[PDB]
Symmetry: C2
Subunit: 306 residues, 2 copies
Amino acid sequence: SGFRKMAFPSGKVEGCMVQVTCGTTTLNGLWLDDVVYCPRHVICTSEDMLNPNYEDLLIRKSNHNFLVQAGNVQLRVIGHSMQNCVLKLKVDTANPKTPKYKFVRIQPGQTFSVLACYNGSPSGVYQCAMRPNFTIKGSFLNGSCGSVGFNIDYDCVSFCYMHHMELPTGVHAGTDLEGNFYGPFVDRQTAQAAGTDTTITVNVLAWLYAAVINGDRWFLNRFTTTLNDFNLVAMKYNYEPLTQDHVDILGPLSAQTGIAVLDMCASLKELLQNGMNGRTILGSALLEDEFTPFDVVRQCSGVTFQ
Amino acid sequence: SGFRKMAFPSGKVEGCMVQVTCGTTTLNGLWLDDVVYCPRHVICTSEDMLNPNYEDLLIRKSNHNFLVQAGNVQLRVIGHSMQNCVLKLKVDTANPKTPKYKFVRIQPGQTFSVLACYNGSPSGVYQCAMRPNFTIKGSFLNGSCGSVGFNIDYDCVSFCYMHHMELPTGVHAGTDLEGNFYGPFVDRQTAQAAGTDTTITVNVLAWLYAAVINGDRWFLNRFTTTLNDFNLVAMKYNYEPLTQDHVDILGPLSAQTGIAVLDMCASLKELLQNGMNGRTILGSALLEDEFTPFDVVRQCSGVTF
């Protein structure tokens, strides 16, 4: 037992990280088959980032202007193209460590692991959520651009995130692996509104189920509620509205614990209206929303990969 | 910027995880060079665990009773020996994926990454601390025994922990890679007292420095304190006493931020006495003690491996 914010094993992704240098700028790239994917702002200087014309900037670059290094191995760039906000560098060698993989665009509220990298070398791995406002609250220092987020299902790596920017507010923004930003953000150093964030209600409920499974039950109460009644409370506390789709995805946890979803909603309602009175749930003094229902089932059932 | 509870990249360890089966029991082993390391209670049935005589139990086992599987590869066991609470199974093949590695015994308060595994297959990685009472608060289901904890320094993996037991209180106990338990625990299914835990003060201070570096400063206050005045408060709140060694290890963070260590202590004292008034620090509503000073420096400077 016990419940931890757990990341996927990162080995399959480590074998794909490379360093990409263009002029004065170095960041991380992702080497899959004979293509290296990286943020297009690798071609920008500090001043370019204030107002970059990427098409004009990229036209001044040739294949030999991109230095790609995999560990100490030098890759030969034989083609380059821009797809949305990512650069695709064709190299003459297929990555022998390419895992089975997919590119996926995840939905707000889904979770993934990030392999933070600098100069093409991994430094750490952590789990986070795509916020409802399409930011992530990561750990990204200068040079971390091109680090990727992913999920693993048995032997298949689903890449869902590539890191591009830190907003002036300190939160993080990036793209899917086709180079489309999550949210309204652009790869330009300018003020960018993220918009109101909200708490991922179905994830909070999943984590309450995880708490019950592990013996934390003080928050279970006498009440029930309706979906509409609960959503009135959700809106007041800036929680995502709960739908029947959410109720259905919580089904297996309700069945294991014997606690109907609307009964758990009534407990959550009381927690929102009355706070936690200085108590904790699974070692947290706040309501946690970075565990999906699938994450909870995974950890409580010992699902494995390779 | 931003500050996350970050684990080490686990690839170097994933390539060492194998499945070890002895009779009816399967758990995880660590395959390094031509030796596989695993908890000795792999030789125990459910009933054996109540009061095992490991010497007698192991005598009934031969090399061919240990099935070691690496992915789909079968390893040939050519020798076995018990070292404290671990079994060392000599195999006829050196693991081609063996990283540079060391075995280290860590101190209470130090942190490490756990690669949680089942049936020899990795399932997830997380960072945790060795508690002052030598337990860890992990996530370990049935079959996770033999999962290991480790740190990485550039290219070298320092293995420090092997998982052996879940105590009836739900916390976790294990050994170094020489098979010596951390804490007073034994590999027997019995009631075992862990003893009073305390909060790792030097780690809380490190995390407050991490907060300041990342822009959380509301807790910075008007006061200072003395080491003794602070330790009177520490003892009242079941915090480890702060020593000069702790002050010294916090030096680099004090220098980066310009906040003297004893001033940060005075901030911590006020947090202990007055709570956080419903505010948060680095997204947490409680004082976090699972980041060491080196952990903070690592994350805030982008150290890589």
